[PDB]
Amino acid sequence: TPVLVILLGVVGLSALTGYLDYVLLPALAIFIGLTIYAIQRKRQAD
């Protein structure tokens, strides 16, 4: 069920809903990139 993967990622976005400048390392921006990339791949692998 590739749809379940999108549901889990959707919940993570809810916990994070506020802007934020960039400090020494945007660990948050990278975390989302890996989260969205993994969800798109699991949902479908081309």
UniProtKB/TrEMBL annotation:
Leader sequence residues: none
Domain of life: Bacteria
One GO CC term on file: membrane
Keyword field contains Lipid metabolism: no
TM segment ranges: 19-39
Keyword Metal-binding part of the UniProt annotation: no
Entry keyword set: Membrane, Transmembrane, Transmembrane helix
Protein's UniProt name: MerF
Source organism: Morganella morganii
Gene (UniProt): merF
Full-sequence range covered: 24 to 69 of 81
